[PDB]
Ligand binder design. Structure first.
Ligand SMILES: O=c1ccn([C@@H]2O[C@H](COP(=O)(O)OP(=O)(O)O[C@H]3O[C@H](CO)[C@@H](O)[C@H](O)[C@H]3F)[C@@H](O)[C@H]2O)c(=O)[nH]1
Length: 370
């Protein structure tokens, strides 16, 4: 019996999609998969034993604490052979690092008033419980930067870390698309042959720099701008970003969508992925774009930004972030189709020659070992 703990399941998050693929891999090896969550949106594999954990606190942090306590009591009466968490909490045998190091985030960005909160104390305590010395929890990591951060704040025993290769779903790959996918999916989405489709995918618009993408769109020269659209796709509220698009006179150019299940089609249809995130532990969409043959503009803060430079299929905007640099890079990329075509080819080549896929098998090995 392998128990999985994540606070919330829904289809439009990387943490959730990585969990689904890892847990499905574990189940397919013959183990019984039990899932504890506060809430579950979308389909659930019939193999899974799904347990909804009742909570009543009025804050995320309070509910998380209640969840941990309830799960511990349930495990006391119904033992599992291994407990695997996708969120930081006590009691895990294995943790998957979908998040950044919270202690480092706070140290770098926050001050005294931020640290006064019960919210801070909780998240710090649950991270500490996972990473501190003396714990047995195996730590499945996405980036070397994550490891450096956790070592800095917790002096975690180095042997407990294991970096995983990426785990991009094969259905995003250019070679897994129907013939004429670009034309078909452009037509499906109302994109004209001559238009530029910019694509931004992710369920945290603010964190992922949707504002930066809108600013970049707005900065384009008049004629180019008139031929350019931006699709913003994810389970988040568009309100603030609609207001910004109106402010900048590009409201009609920007199309907002809730969570979509057709991201593979959108990447086949698009001309550039924009992902100028403020914070991103890794960024699965960056590598999805690589596998789709979709060139990428992103920021150096993203854990997976280096892959864009490695694949030579876009531009990584350096820190400190310059909006003017992103604006110029966008204008250049859009006006230089030969550059974009070369980037796309480079992306496809990298996707064909690099392991961007095996994460769930390697994570399942760690989970089921022994
Ligand atoms: O409307 C939508 C919106 C998204 N998706 C999919 O959800 C995934 C999003 O993962 P991504 O790593 O890009 O961002 P995020 O969800 O913030 O992931 C966290 O967890 C990730 C690790 O699990 C980590 O990479 C990241 O840094 C964390 F913030 C990616 O596979 C998208 O194609 C979708 O299908 N439809």
């Amino acid at each position: 019996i392998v128990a999985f703990c994540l606070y919330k399941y829904f289809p439009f998050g990387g943490l959730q999609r990585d969990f689904m693929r890892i847990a499905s891999t574990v189940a397919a090896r013959g183990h019984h998969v039990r899932v504890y969550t506060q809430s579950w949106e979308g389909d659930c594999p019939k193999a899974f034993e799904l347990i909804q954990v009742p909570v009543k606190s009025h804050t995320n942090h309070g509910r998380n604490a209640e969840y941990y306590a309830w799960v511990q009591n349930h495990l006391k009466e119904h033992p599992a052979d291994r407990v695997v968490g996708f969120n930081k909490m006590p009691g895990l045998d294995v943790y998957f690092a979908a998040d950044v190091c919270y202690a480092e985030k706070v140290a770098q960005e926050k001050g005294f008033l931020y640290r006064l909160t019960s919210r801070y104390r909780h998240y710090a305590a649950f991270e500490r419980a996972t990473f501190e010395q003396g714990k047995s929890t195996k730590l499945m990591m996405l980036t070397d930067k994550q490891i450096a951060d956790f070592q800095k704040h917790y002096q975690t025993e180095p042997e407990r870390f294991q970096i995983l290769p990426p785990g991009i779903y094969p259905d995003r790959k250019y070679s897994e698309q129907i013939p004429n996918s670009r034309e078909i999916y452009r037509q499906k989405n109302g994109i004209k042959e001559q238009q530029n489709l910019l694509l931004q995918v992710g369920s945290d618009f603010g964190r992922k720099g949707v504002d930066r993408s809108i600013e970049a769109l707005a900065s384009l020269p008049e004629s180019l701008r008139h031929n350019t659209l931006l699709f913003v796709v994810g389970q988040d509220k568009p309100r603030k970003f609609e207001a910004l698009a109106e402010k900048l006179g590009v409201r009609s150019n920007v199309h907002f969508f809730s969570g979509r299940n057709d991201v593979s089609e959108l990447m086949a249809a698009a001309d550039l992925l924009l992902h100028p995130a403020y914070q991103e532990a890794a960024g699965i969409v960056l590598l999805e774009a690589i596998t789709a043959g979709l060139p990428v503009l992103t920021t150096a803060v993203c854990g997976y930004a280096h892959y864009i430079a490695d694949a030579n299929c876009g531009t990584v905007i350096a820190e400190p972030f310059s909006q003017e640099q992103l604006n110029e890079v966008l204008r250049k990329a859009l006006t230089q189709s030969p550059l974009r075509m070369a980037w796309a080819e480079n992306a496809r080549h990298y996707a064909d020659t690099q392991d961007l896929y095996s994460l769930p098998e390697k994570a399942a090995d760690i989970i089921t070992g022994g």
